[PDB]
Design a protein around this ligand. Structure first.
Ligand SMILES: COC(=O)Nc1ccc(-c2ccnc([C@H](Cc3ccccc3)NC(=O)/C=C/c3cc(Cl)ccc3-n3cnnn3)c2)cc1
Ligand SMILES: *[C@@H]1O[C@H](CO)[C@@H](O)[C@H](O)[C@H]1NC(C)=O
Length: 237
């Protein structure tokens, strides 16, 4: 997260850090708890992933330094990638992880609601991107989960910034026209969370952008509301 600030324990209880154990253990991507055994994340995260056996989902984590040998985690039973996915910039950048066990909800780990299909005409004005990603293009993963408040940008304005890419209605953009705050490397897969009527909704999944927090180059997120039926279909299978 560029221009982010530290989060506190229990602030983003749906946020997870997804690690790969091959060849060595490291943070791969963010994700969000959406159900008892389900994490919603980005399909692009699994490009170099051999099988679900090499993945570990860590919930209730504020600091990466808290992740050691005896740290509790959730194994992954299945990786479900949208069957139309090809590349982040062409959309369908969405995946589910079916966990090996159910998740007992606590203050440190609980699901975020999906956006309401009735809330299509909803104007979200309290949106936040979170993650352990870089603070600039050439950086390193951050120890403490970071957050940044970012405004949504219309699809029409976003399309003007990205003449070489198709910005579809299945994408949502966010960022400051004057730059400065945005997701960056290591944040993808995590949530763009909007608080509406005192309830948090998972509005976007961090997907891609041209550079990090550059002027007139908003971040591009998967528009979760456009995938509600796909998510319900796959989570009941
Ligand atoms: C010790 O462990 C480690 O060091 N771990 C560690 C270090 C680096 C990375 C990493 C590097 C590069 N890209 C990403 C992924 C893309 C990715 C590709 C393959 C697998 C996973 C993820 N893209 C983002 O995260 C976000 C991109 C992005 C998103 C928005 Cl919304 C706006 C602007 C963006 N950027 C444009 N250029 N950079 N970011 C992740 C992952 C893990
Ligand atoms: C969840 O809580 C129940 C009751 O305390 C316990 O029996 C079970 O082992 C817990 N399961 C997980 C996955 O933590």
């Amino acid at each position: 997260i560029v221009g982010g600030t530290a989060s506190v324990r229990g602030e983003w209880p749906w946020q997870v850090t997804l690690h790969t154990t091959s060849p060595t253990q490291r943070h791969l991507c963010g994700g969000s708890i959406i159900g008892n055994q389900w994490i919603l994340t980005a399909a692009h995260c699994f490009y170099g992933v051999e099988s679900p056996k090499i993945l570990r989902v860590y919930s209730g984590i504020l600091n990466q330094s808290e992740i050691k040998e005896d740290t509790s985690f959730f194994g992954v039973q299945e990786i479900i990638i949208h069957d139309q996915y090809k590349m982040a910039e062409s959309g369908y950048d969405i995946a589910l992880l079916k966990l090996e066990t159910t998740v007992n909800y606590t203050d440190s780990q609980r699901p975020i609601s999906l956006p309401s299909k009735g809330d299509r005409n909803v104007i979200y004005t309290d949106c936040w991107v979170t993650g352990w990603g870089y603070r600039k293009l050439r950086d390193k993963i951050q120890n403490t989960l970071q957050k940044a408040k970012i405004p949504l940008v219309t699809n029409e304005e976003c399309q003007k910034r990205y003449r070489g890419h198709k910005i579809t209605h299945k994408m949502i953009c966010a960022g400051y026209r004057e730059g400065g705050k945005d997701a960056c490397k290591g944040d993808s897969g995590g949530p763009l969370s909007c608080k509406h009527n005192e309830v948090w909704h998972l509005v976007g999944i961090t997907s891609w952008g041209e550079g990090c927090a550059q002027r007139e180059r908003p971040g591009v997120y998967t528009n979760v509301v456009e995938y509600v039926d796909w998510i319900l279909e796959k989570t009941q299978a």
